[PDB]
Design a protein around this ligand. Sequence first.
Ligand code: HEM
Ligand SMILES: OC[C@H]1O[C@H](O[C@H]2[C@H](O)[C@@H](O)[C@H](OCCCCCC3CCCCC3)O[C@@H]2CO)[C@H](O)[C@@H](O)[C@@H]1O
Ligand SMILES: OC[C@H]1O[C@@](CO)(O[C@H]2O[C@H](CO)[C@@H](O)[C@H](O)[C@H]2O)[C@@H](O)[C@@H]1O
Ligand SMILES: *C(=O)Cc1ccc(C(C)(C)C)cc1
Length: 465
Amino acid sequence: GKLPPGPSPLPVLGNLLQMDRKGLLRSFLRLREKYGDVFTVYLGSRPVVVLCGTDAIREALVDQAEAFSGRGKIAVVDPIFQGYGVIFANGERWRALRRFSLATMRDFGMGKRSVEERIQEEARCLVEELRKSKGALLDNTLLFHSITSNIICSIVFGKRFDYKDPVFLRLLDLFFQSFSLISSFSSQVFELFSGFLKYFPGTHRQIYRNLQEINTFIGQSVEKHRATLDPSNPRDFIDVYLLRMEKDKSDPSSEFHHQNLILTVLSLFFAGTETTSTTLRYGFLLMLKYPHVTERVQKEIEQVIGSHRPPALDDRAKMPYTDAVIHEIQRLGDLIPFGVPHTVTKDTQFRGYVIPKNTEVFPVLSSALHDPRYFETPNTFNPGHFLDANGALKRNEGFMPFSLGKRICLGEGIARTELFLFFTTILQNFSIASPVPPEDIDLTPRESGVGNVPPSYQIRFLARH
Ligand code: HEM
Ligand SMILES: OC[C@H]1O[C@H](O[C@H]2[C@H](O)[C@@H](O)[C@H](OCCCCCC3CCCCC3)O[C@@H]2CO)[C@H](O)[C@@H](O)[C@@H]1O
Ligand SMILES: OC[C@H]1O[C@@](CO)(O[C@H]2O[C@H](CO)[C@@H](O)[C@H](O)[C@H]2O)[C@@H](O)[C@@H]1O
Ligand SMILES: *C(=O)Cc1ccc(C(C)(C)C)cc1
């Protein structure tokens, strides 16, 4: 019962504790080189198994899906962490989230328009909004944040907001705008001894100002909903949930309920949506750099959709190249380098070694996204990574931006639809330009850490007509 090959732990300080993305990337390439695709690294009295590349990951997530279906444990004591962390600490709860979203999506087509439809509409308002700029230089960051969020809003709150609407413009900041944290060793030391640091450790100071403001909007939205709830005609996710806890009314569990709800929506709302908004953004940075490929995309749109018909989810199958560009964008955007960690639910043999129950495993997705065994030019934008001999779309075995297995992204589908419609629509209507020349656009992600996010950039949308 030996774990896989690995380096030597350093006691309670950290052999490699505190390294930065670049330093670790260097360390990671070495470890993988020293031990292979499956190695063990030791941290704070615990071993985490690291899976590298297409094969190792697939052997784990897919060939032994259940064994690896455990989600990384989260152990801390706080107020905020306790109440919420618990709600989703269990693996069963995660399943419950899926089980509800799929069934609800199936049985309750809520509001005279399907998902693909609400996205075709949002794109339509985007094209309407993009003209209101009249060819100026703006930052897609907020726009792309708006459109992708509106979708989650529609499906959950039963409506979409207008890009200028304050209730929306402000909610967008609550979730997506970054807050700088200012501290100094001096101040930190003072806080620790007399700081009541146990009370506002790290980021709590900031979150609570958003958390309270958010818990408010939801809380009051749930309320406006519950009062107009036609039990024969639900309108959105919230109604369909209200109808469920109408039995549990006359109990104080409602406070527990409402809280259950808030995170689910935020977790659903921000992590998926933010990732999608970033993917789009990154997508257009690429589009600027490689104008050649941007043209083909446009030319193809023209041969299948034309200049007037709004693009639909059915064109994706008749547009192999544009679909290939979107795969590449996801492969290179690579927003989740290490990927959410797993925990193996039982004593699991793996390539001969033995990973004990609850041994946290890291499926490094980036190592697959860039896996040389599966991509001709692993670090170069190349739509050919996904096109067969006859210019048709072949699947690449190493393409897993949404991870794999039982634990795959609950929004993988809804996301890819957003990506294709938003992309083809924008490009069917507008032409893109930037101050920077393509050959000087740097794609290198600003990498504060824990995720790839592209550098800021201006962009110009020109209506072809
Ligand atoms: C757009 C690009 C997106 C990417 C690259 C992405 C990626 C991922 C990854 C890597 C995971 C976890 C993988 C694992 O547990 O092994 C995940 C899980 C999840 N994602 Fe996303 N996601 C995206 C969009 C979205 C969207 C739009 C939503 C909307 C709700 C969403 C909601 C979720 C949820 C609910 C899970 C839970 C996984 C589980 O059930 O255990 N994601 N996603
Ligand atoms: O058995 C095959 C059937 O299922 C597919 O439709 C699924 C699709 O998988 C898909 O359209 C959807 O699954 C999505 C489940 C998770 C919800 C996605 C997001 C919705 C918004 C909030 C966040 C989650 O549910 C549909 C109905 O269950 C096929 O596309 C259908 O044509 C077919 O009837
Ligand atoms: O995330 C995997 C998921 O996407 C789908 C979409 O059909 O995979 C297929 O479709 C893609 C988009 O065009 C291609 O990569 C390819 O045609 C195919 O693998 C799902 O079937 C799958 O579960
Ligand atoms: C974008 O998808 C970032 C992201 C990935 C995964 C998650 C979960 C798995 C829900 C914590 C959040 C945000």
